[PDB]
Amino acid sequence: IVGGQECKDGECPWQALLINEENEGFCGGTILSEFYILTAAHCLYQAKRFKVRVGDRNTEQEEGGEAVHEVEVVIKHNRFTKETYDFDIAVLRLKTPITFRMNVAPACLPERDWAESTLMTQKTGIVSGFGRTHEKGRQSTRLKMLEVPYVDRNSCKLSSSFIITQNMFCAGYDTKQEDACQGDSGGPHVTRFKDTYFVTGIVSWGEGCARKGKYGIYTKVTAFLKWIDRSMKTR
Amino acid sequence: KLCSLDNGDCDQFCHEEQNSVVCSCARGYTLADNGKACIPTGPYPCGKQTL
Ligand SMILES: O=C([C@H]1CN(S(=O)(=O)c2ccc3cc(Cl)ccc3c2)CC(=O)N1CC1CCN(c2ccncc2)CC1)N1CCOCC1
Ligand SMILES: [Ca+2]
């Protein structure tokens, strides 16, 4: 996360972190339930063996409320391909249940129509993670959040060197030095409504970090709802 | 009707029935007695910041 504020106690309870054997956070996730994590498909390429961590806000100080979970089954979307970055979505079935406590709680899954009509027509959304705070800097040590404006779908394409597909959507700023960055992938993009948060997107890609004329590209969660449900029943 | 007015005055999901609105909630919530508000069932309902 380049810029933006820090996630204060209890603010980003649905954040999940994928860690490699070196316990290095390399990607993000969104807690969907005591058993499931939502992430980006391309994140299952940035590591070999990995576990998902929750309840963490500072990767260097045992806050006590953290917890590590192993992966029983990872559900990648077949249609996903790295040459287009289309269908950048995956579901993770946890071996053991996530016990919800302070800093550890799930984000709601909205309904397709209401979501597209009310959630994304909103002014902004929130993205977060332990990713880099600059394009060349290092992986953040503290979990961060950032209010990113929804970006008109046209400009999105007009500014993109790559085809923004039906399963993606732009969010962020044109010049303002704020946007997600490396390591934030798979992380959550949530929209607030009457003090209740709903998953609306997965951190997918972008050309560099916070570049002028460039936007953050998120996976359109509303476009895989039924898919996400089919995965919850494991399939 | 008119889930477009102010989300039909619902707390979460709003639907229309040719003439009226029909509110509904996310998993873990139960529709209140006014058929509009949503109420949690556990101490950790989805989408709430554990402040
Ligand atoms: O350099 C890259 C990638 C990601 N990064 S990144 O800094 O980490 C990165 C990753 C995810 C983001 C998500 C949001 Cl929302 C906003 C900014 C982001 C920045 C930037 C980049 O330009 N690129 C190059 C590009 C390579 C090919 N792309 C497409 C897109 C559509 N169709 C085809 C190809 C997009 C990114 N690497 C090297 C380090 O390891 C990770 C991969
Ligand atoms: Ca910690």
Annotated domain spans of chain B? 1-51
B1 to chain A, closest Cα gap in Å: 14
Q: What is the rounded CA–CA span in Å between residue A101 and residue A88?
A: 29
C-alpha distance from residue A1 to each of A75, A87, A196, A209 (Å): 26, 23, 22, 9
What is the interface size between A and B, counted as CB pairs within 8 Å?
68
Contact assessment for residue A85 and residue A223, using Cβ atoms and an 8 Å cutoff: no
Assess if CATH 2.10.25.10 describes domain B1-51: yes
DSSP state, residue A116:
I
Q: Which residues are found with C-beta within 5 Å of the ion, ligand 2? A: A 56, 58, 63
Give the C-alpha separation, B31 to A8, whole Å. Answer: 30
A195 to chain B: which residues are within 8 Å by CB? 48-49
Question: Tell me, what amino acid is at A152?
Answer: D
Reduced to 3 states, what is the DSSP secondary structure of residue A137?
Answer: coil
What is the spatial distance between Cα A112 and Cα B30, in angstroms, rounded to a whole number? 19
Residues of A with active-site annotation = 42, 88, 185
CB count within 10 Å of CB A105 equals 25
Is the beta carbon of A148 within 6 A of some atom in ligand 1?
Answer: no
CA-nearest of A216, A152, A205, A150 to A178 is A216
Test mutation, B46, B48, B51, chain A, max A CBs within 10 A: B46
Structure tokens at A149: 């404006």
Would an 8 Å CB–CB cutoff place A233 in contact with chain B? no
Alpha helices in A98-218, H assignment, sequence order: 112-114, 153-159
Residues of chain A contacting B7 with CB distance shorter than 8 Å = 118
Among all chains, which residue has been given the structure tokens 């039909």?
Answer: B8
Q: Which ligand is nearest to the CA of A17?
A: 2
- Rounded to whole angstroms, the Cα distance separating B33 from B39 reads 10
- Compute CA distances A120 → A60, A110, A173, A195, whole Å: 35, 11, 16, 16
Of B13, B43, B46, the CB nearest to A111: B13
**CA–CA distance, A138 with A164 (Å, rounded to integer):** 28
What the block records as the tokens of A36 is 């499931």
CA distance A226 to chain B (A): 14
CA atoms of B40 and A195, how far apart (whole Å)? 13
Cβ contacts of B38 on chain A, cutoff 8 Å: 196
Q: Which domains does chain A have, with CATH numbers?
A: 1-12+107-222 (2.40.10.10), 13-106+223-235 (2.40.10.10)
φ/ψ of A142, rounded to 5, equals -120, 145
Token readout for A61 is 């100080």
Q: How many residues does chain B have?
A: 51
Does the Cβ of A188 fall within 6 Å of ligand 1?
no
Q: Give the C-alpha distances (Å, rounded to integers) separating B27 from A8, A43, A111, B23, B31.
A: 26, 27, 11, 13, 11
Copy the structure tokens of residue A179: 């946007």
- DSSP strands (E only) in chain A: 5-6, 15-19, 25-31, 36-39, 51-54, 67-69, 71-76, 90-94, 124-129, 144-149, 168-171, 188-193, 196-205, 216-220
The answer to whether the CB of A145 falls within 8 A of the CB of A5 is yes
In the numeric block, the tokens 């500072």 are attached to A58
Q: Is A178 in the pocket of ligand 1 (CB under 6 A)?
A: no
Q: State the resolution, in angstroms.
A: 2.6
Which residues of chain A come before a gap where C and the next N are over 2.5 Å apart? none
Q: How far is the CA of A16 from the centre of ligand 1 (A)?
A: 20
Tokens of A186: 């798979």
Q: Which residue has 């576990």 as its token pair?
A: A51
Dihedral over Cα of A141, A180, A225, A165: its sign: negative
